[PDB]
């Protein structure tokens, strides 16, 4: 029922890059999803205490959210675009794993994911 430590957003010994694909992931992908009317439940780690989801972290072992992704991108945490794309996919997957099919939160994730897929389709060549 308690919250775990959040995912890391800094690791000084993890090697980093700033590539045009990672720049696109911040400037286009994250910014598009962040501003959406359905972004709010995904803008920070799930607070299982405030939201009264005492089983959330029993089920979700790889938490991810856009607050974390935003910080990772701003702090150049990633080596490659695939790591960041995986974080978005983990976020959506967690939502679909935890929640009841057809719930409104699942519709919210689906709307963000549709946009994510449209943007990733045009990921620039390195």
Curated annotation (Swiss-Prot):
Location of the Bromo domain: 17-123
Superkingdom assignment: Eukaryota
Tissue spec: Ubiquitously expressed.
Cross-link entry Glycyl lysine isopeptide (Lys-Gly) (interchain with G-Cter in SUMO2), positions: 58
UniProt PTM: Phosphorylation by CK2 disrupt the intramolecular binding between the bromo domain 2 and the NPS region and promotes binding between the NPS and the BID regions, leading to activate the protein and promote binding to acetylated histones. In absence of phosphorylation, BRD4 does not localize to p53/TP53 target gene promoters, phosphorylation promoting recruitment to p53/TP53 target promoters.
Site (Acetylated histone binding): residue numbering on this chain: 99
UniProt subcellular location: Nucleus; Chromosome
Additional record remark: JQ1, a thieno-triazolo-1,4-diazepine derivative, and I-BET, a benzodiazepine derivative, have been tested on tumors with success. Treatment with GSK1210151A (I-BET151, a I-BET derivative) has strong effets on mixed lineage leukemia and promotes myeloid differentiation and leukemia stem-cell depletion.
Domain comment in the entry: The NET domain mediates interaction with a number of chromatin proteins involved in transcription regulation (NSD3, JMJD6, CHD4, GLTSCR1 and ATAD5). The C-terminal (CTD) region mediates interaction and recruitment of CDK9 and CCNT1 subunits of the P-TEFb complex. It is also required for maintenance of higher-order chromatin structure.
Its job: Chromatin reader protein that recognizes and binds acetylated histones and plays a key role in transmission of epigenetic memory across cell divisions and transcription regulation. Remains associated with acetylated chromatin throughout the entire cell cycle and provides epigenetic memory for postmitotic G1 gene transcription by preserving acetylated chromatin status and maintaining high-order chromatin structure. During interphase, plays a key role in regulating the transcription of signal-inducible genes by associating with the P-TEFb complex and recruiting it to promoters.
Quaternary assembly: Interacts with p53/TP53; the interaction is direct. Interacts (via CTD region) with CDK9 and CCNT1, acting as an associated component of P-TEFb complex. Interacts with RELA (when acetylated at 'Lys-310'). Interacts (via NET domain) with NSD3, CHD4, BICRA and ATAD5. The interaction with BICRA bridges BRD4 to the GBAF complex. Interacts (via NET domain) with JMJD6 (via JmjC and N-terminal domains); the interaction is stronger in presence of ssRNA and recruits JMJD6 on distal enhancers. Interacts with NSD3. Interacts with NIPBL. (Microbial infection) Interacts with bovine papillomavirus type 1 regulatory protein E2. This interactions may serve for the tethering of viral genomes to host mitotic chromosomes allowing successful partitioning of the viral genome during cell division.
Family according to the record: Belongs to the BET family.
Disease: Cornelia de Lange syndrome 6: A form of Cornelia de Lange syndrome, a clinically heterogeneous developmental disorder associated with malformations affecting multiple systems. It is characterized by facial dysmorphisms, abnormal hands and feet, growth delay, cognitive retardation, hirsutism, gastroesophageal dysfunction and cardiac, ophthalmologic and genitourinary anomalies. CDLS6 inheritance is autosomal dominant.
Name of this protein: Bromodomain-containing protein 4
Gene: BRD4
């Amino acid at each position: 029922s308690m919250n775990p430590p959040p995912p890391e957003t800094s690791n000084p010994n993890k090697p980093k890059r700033q590539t045009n694909q990672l720049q696109y992931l911040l400037r286009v992908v994250l910014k598009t999803l962040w501003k959406h009317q359905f972004a709010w439940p995904f803008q920070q780690p799930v607070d299982a205490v405030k939201l009264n989801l005492p089983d959330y972290y029993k089920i979700i072992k790889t938490p991810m959210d856009m607050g974390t992704i935003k910080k990772r991108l701003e702090n150049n945490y990633y080596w490659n675009a695939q790591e960041c794309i995986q974080d978005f996919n983990t976020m959506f997957t967690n939502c679909y794993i935890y929640n009841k099919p057809g719930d409104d939160i699942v519709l919210m994730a689906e709307a963000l994911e549709k946009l994510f897929l449209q943007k990733i389709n045009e990921l620039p060549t390195e």
